Write a protein that binds this ligand. Structure first.
Ligand code: CA
Ligand code: CA
Length: 275
């Protein structure tokens, strides 16, 4: 029996599926802890590992990358869940180890691999409080090259008037994704600040876990993949659009929620964004 996670319905992905757009031929890189190739509800197109001690990117020792991948593209079949862009070409770019941490160079190496391999979209459901010159140069190179770069905003809540958006979401060339619950209210852990761009579901997100399992997580790392999947739906309908066009449409077609400090432009609506 397959269920459609509510977060998928919440951004209006099913209306695109009904028009016949499911993300076909769009290459999405999941830059995370790897993707479990043994999961029957995922189809992996390729990948690479930048973690020297964990060289198989098809081995997810943290569970995180597999869950993120499932939100992007869990297959439309008879089991499990349904991703935002079920027909997208999924790449496992492993940059995080079994403990969930990763060095900045591994992450940069992974962004470089994605550009070289002509990824359409990159999802980075990770963040740190400190940026680096080389990390910024690498995201900038992705966007300059035409890739859509999506990242979690961070789970640092608020801190008065300070921005709590982590890196790389804090950079202007990246789309930073905060999380709302099912009633469109921001999750209390959702980072805020001027660098916050858009919101997506990130509370009790049911997705794929390693070992042919399913389970829910909360966090802006679960909001992110919704937007990456939306970008893949847009590109399946308008393959000629640039990342400039995709980012613009996503931000110009949101459902306004509250004050941008807390909500960015609002909740994405992929049905509107796709034109
Ligand atoms: Ca499924
Ligand atoms: Ca940003």
């Amino acid at each position: 029996a397959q269920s459609v996670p509510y977060g998928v319905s919440q951004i209006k992905a099913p209306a695109l599926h009904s028009q016949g757009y499911t993300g076909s031929n769009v290459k999405v890189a999941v830059i995370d802890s790897g993707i479990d190739s043994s999961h029957p509800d995922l189809k992996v197109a390729g990948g690479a590992s930048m973690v020297p001690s964990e060289t198989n990117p098809f081995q997810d020792n943290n569970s995180h990358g597999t869950h993120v991948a499932g939100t992007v593209a869990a297959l439309n079949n008879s089991i499990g869940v349904l991703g935002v862009a079920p027909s997208a070409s999924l790449y496992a770019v492993k940059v995080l180890g079994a403990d969930g941490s990763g060095q900045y160079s591994w992450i940069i190496n992974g962004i470089e691999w994605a550009i070289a391999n002509n990824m359409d979209v990159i999802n980075m459901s990770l963040g740190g409080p400190s940026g680096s010159a080389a990390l910024k140069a690498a995201v900038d190179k992705a966007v300059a090259s035409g890739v859509v770069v999506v990242a979690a905003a961070g789970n640092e809540g608020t801190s008065g008037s300070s921005s709590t958006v982590g890196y790389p979401g804090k950079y202007p060339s990246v789309i930073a994704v905060g999380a709302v619950d099912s009633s469109n209210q921001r999750a209390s852990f959702s980072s805020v600040g001027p660098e916050l761009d858009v919101m997506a579901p990130g509370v009790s997100i049911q997705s794929t876990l390693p070992g042919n399992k399913y389970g829910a997580y909360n966090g802006t790392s679960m909001a992110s993949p919704h937007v990456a999947g939306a970008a893949a739906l847009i590109l399946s309908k308008h393959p000629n659009w640039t990342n400039t066009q995709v980012r613009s449409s996503l931000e110009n077609t949101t459902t306004k929620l509250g004050d941008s400090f807390y909500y960015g432009k609002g909740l994405i609506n992929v049905q509107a964004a796709a034109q």
